[PDB]
């Protein structure tokens, strides 16, 4: 009755909703359920900005599963304003909505008063009641950086992923990712235990480089994944069939990995080898073959919670879990 | 060509506007500037709230002289929204102190810089680059000097000390109140330029702000009181009592046992000829007070608009004998 999902990004939050919908958790409860859902949530995009701690992936899961996202926009609170962000531009310095800033103010007060991120998250979840346990991948700092060639002086510089995505991406040469603090971080409370005691571990179809990937840079987390009795089932984020055949993922390009279901599967690799996967789900019409890995094509579009519920169901089946 | 004003509250900001209109400064500039205006701004009400530093008297002066102040309330931005405050309520966390969305940006930038080591005086200059107040807004101190209120708390009848913000904003001066304490004043050094601005002034003015909790706490900083007593400039005070007609400076005066009269408040600051601070003391039309060592003159003293206040300023310059 225990599912653990590694998550990051808007896709991570939408996949958890499907897990909730299948198992009758959170907003989808009818009577108190028979299952508990645990998310190990990327902290790689976490940053101190304007004197307040911003945790995008934890916030996205918390608002989404708590019913706080705006249905039309698909991101951020309903009835959101950006008046503080406006004054900040006027003073000359994410989207940083007014309602969103309240979450940052409360989180910053708790962190500066000694509460670790794991407890700050539980405290915020009392209001949002996601119906899921949101464990930060680490209570230590582990911020995803992108090394560029800086055009002012031609020097290699490490830039926070958030700045790189909006300002430098596809505008200057980009060489590598760096996980600033990763080597000095430990797996956050409950995370190694959640991976060990699960009936099944799912890697959500988030960006493999900068949403799932940074979770794997926290010491201890990769070890738990490779040793757990739970089956590990990954979902491909590559959706073929788009107009003009879509685009390559830019973060995969930085590490020179092709934007195919085959390549991303090899990136996580086979647990029979030195990788992480027992199973690998790819979208209807797609194909992959990896020595040691169960590959199945099924629909993988998170159209709505009910489609995502079917995607979860396919993962349980491929694993052999009930 | 140098005037220095001690300020606190909405009235201090509105008095500064009158100085600016008289000398053609700030928004009132028409042609080259021949005068520089320095404000020494009360820091007694500053507080940390929600993990951000709130400096109300500085912000009031900055917003007012920069054209961003709220004419209806007099404190905070025009066209203010309170969505972040509402979300703070939804989380169930103080809740008697309004932090507007626009105003919160000021607090975020101030906080970020203070925590990075920038002294308050530098944060203020940095923020004034956007607002262009047309005046130098000097914090009375770069160190902490917060006014506290000793009350009897009604939930349990125990003596408690609360920040001035809580006594005024939450209880509205209705709880039994015993004393004020200027926690940190004796350990606070006079902020950069403050002593120099009092020393090099052609004239020093005390705005008609609250004498106990706006002007008074400036005077608790040891260096500042000394500069006033040794400066060559005349010091001209404006009485905040427009007696007979209505603000509860009345209630703070009551706490320290001072009568709510023009005579009493003038004696509170006292004569430089004695152990006091004033050379001159202006009171409203219809009032009478005179203090030995102090030239007292009744003049109109209502800050209805900048041009009336401009007259109030000139009346001080005249009484001092400066042109
Ligand atoms: Ca298509
Ligand atoms: Ca000190
Ligand atoms: Ca004293």
XYZ file of C-alpha atoms in Angstrom, chain A residues 102-276:
175
model
C 3.521 34.650 1.371
C 4.645 31.009 1.065
C 8.262 32.272 0.744
C 7.965 34.602 3.798
C 6.630 31.782 6.057
C 9.208 29.276 4.760
C 12.105 31.768 5.306
C 11.016 32.492 8.928
C 10.963 28.743 9.746
C 14.347 28.061 8.063
C 15.970 30.994 9.887
C 14.428 29.790 13.177
C 16.093 26.391 12.716
C 13.413 24.191 11.142
C 14.769 21.981 8.342
C 13.076 22.074 4.909
C 11.422 18.701 5.586
C 9.592 20.176 8.596
C 8.938 23.521 6.870
C 7.169 21.522 4.152
C 4.965 19.575 6.608
C 4.013 22.868 8.286
C 2.960 24.410 4.953
C 1.116 21.206 3.994
C -1.175 21.599 7.020
C -2.869 24.381 5.120
C -2.759 22.737 1.687
C -3.345 19.117 2.732
C -1.904 17.591 -0.467
C -2.895 14.076 0.558
C 0.711 13.029 -0.044
C 4.006 13.054 1.829
C 6.359 15.550 0.125
C 9.914 14.746 1.224
C 12.609 17.159 -0.004
C 15.384 15.113 -1.599
C 17.691 16.783 0.951
C 17.459 19.216 3.869
C 20.892 20.517 2.751
C 21.508 22.910 -0.146
C 21.990 21.273 -3.514
C 21.363 23.809 -6.261
C 21.532 22.949 -9.960
C 23.935 25.203 -11.821
C 24.784 25.560 -15.523
C 28.356 26.380 -16.597
C 28.437 28.837 -19.522
C 30.988 30.861 -21.464
C 30.196 34.372 -20.206
C 30.165 36.900 -23.087
C 31.465 39.847 -21.020
C 34.881 38.232 -20.568
C 34.828 34.716 -22.086
C 35.217 33.005 -18.670
C 33.500 29.814 -17.639
C 30.862 30.722 -15.061
C 28.367 28.696 -13.055
C 24.859 30.104 -13.223
C 21.799 28.969 -11.305
C 19.503 26.881 -13.533
C 16.711 29.425 -13.026
C 18.799 32.299 -14.415
C 20.209 30.121 -17.197
C 16.776 29.012 -18.400
C 15.276 32.491 -18.811
C 18.387 34.531 -19.721
C 21.322 32.521 -21.045
C 19.663 29.444 -22.573
C 20.363 29.211 -26.326
C 22.182 32.529 -26.187
C 25.738 31.574 -25.106
C 27.811 28.386 -25.130
C 26.718 25.947 -22.411
C 29.167 23.309 -21.192
C 27.902 21.283 -18.211
C 25.634 21.128 -15.205
C 27.068 21.359 -11.702
C 25.207 20.365 -8.523
C 26.481 23.000 -6.103
C 26.424 21.444 -2.639
C 25.463 17.938 -3.796
C 28.624 16.285 -2.453
C 28.088 17.786 1.047
C 24.379 16.871 1.281
C 22.706 13.857 2.842
C 19.412 12.272 1.828
C 16.596 14.123 3.599
C 14.711 12.549 6.499
C 12.531 9.658 5.456
C 13.800 9.548 1.862
C 16.080 6.490 2.077
C 13.432 4.762 4.205
C 10.696 5.668 1.695
C 12.749 4.106 -1.098
C 13.512 1.009 0.961
C 10.017 0.237 2.235
C 8.053 0.965 -0.935
C 6.041 -1.624 -2.756
C 7.134 0.203 -5.927
C 9.258 3.207 -6.893
C 8.224 5.401 -9.859
C 10.334 8.013 -11.655
C 7.845 10.549 -12.986
C 8.137 11.619 -16.674
C 9.925 14.804 -15.648
C 13.060 16.159 -17.303
C 15.689 13.472 -16.724
C 18.558 15.941 -16.433
C 17.265 18.711 -14.181
C 14.148 17.306 -12.531
C 14.841 13.638 -11.765
C 18.601 13.843 -12.329
C 19.490 16.178 -9.442
C 17.640 13.950 -6.949
C 20.163 11.278 -7.960
C 23.087 13.533 -7.033
C 22.144 13.546 -3.304
C 24.475 11.049 -1.579
C 22.546 8.024 -0.436
C 19.591 8.338 -2.803
C 21.209 6.433 -5.681
C 22.311 3.741 -3.240
C 18.791 3.239 -1.899
C 17.426 3.068 -5.465
C 19.892 0.342 -6.461
C 19.335 -1.771 -3.361
C 15.596 -1.569 -2.737
C 13.464 -4.673 -3.071
C 10.809 -2.484 -4.643
C 10.598 -2.608 -8.431
C 11.751 0.647 -10.040
C 9.675 1.777 -13.004
C 10.609 4.843 -15.065
C 8.401 6.798 -17.471
C 9.783 8.279 -20.652
C 9.308 12.059 -21.017
C 9.798 11.882 -24.824
C 6.493 12.422 -26.659
C 6.944 11.820 -30.416
C 4.280 12.779 -32.953
C 4.283 16.520 -32.372
C 3.990 19.031 -35.223
C 7.310 19.439 -37.032
C 8.430 16.405 -34.939
C 8.790 18.619 -31.851
C 12.135 19.880 -30.555
C 15.076 18.278 -28.766
C 15.174 18.790 -25.015
C 17.693 21.533 -24.352
C 18.948 20.151 -21.036
C 19.578 16.744 -22.633
C 21.507 18.562 -25.381
C 23.867 20.125 -22.811
C 25.003 16.634 -21.761
C 24.914 15.447 -25.388
C 22.077 12.977 -25.016
C 19.615 12.402 -27.822
C 15.981 13.248 -27.245
C 14.754 9.661 -27.728
C 13.092 7.135 -25.409
C 16.070 4.874 -26.112
C 18.705 7.400 -24.990
C 16.898 8.532 -21.829
C 16.449 4.898 -20.823
C 20.171 4.338 -21.227
C 20.787 7.459 -19.141
C 19.010 5.933 -16.140
C 20.305 2.499 -17.169
C 19.477 -1.023 -16.026
C 19.559 -2.140 -12.375
C 20.817 -5.496 -13.655
C 23.790 -3.412 -14.818
C 24.860 -0.302 -12.895
C 21.722 1.731 -13.638
C 18.434 2.353 -11.919
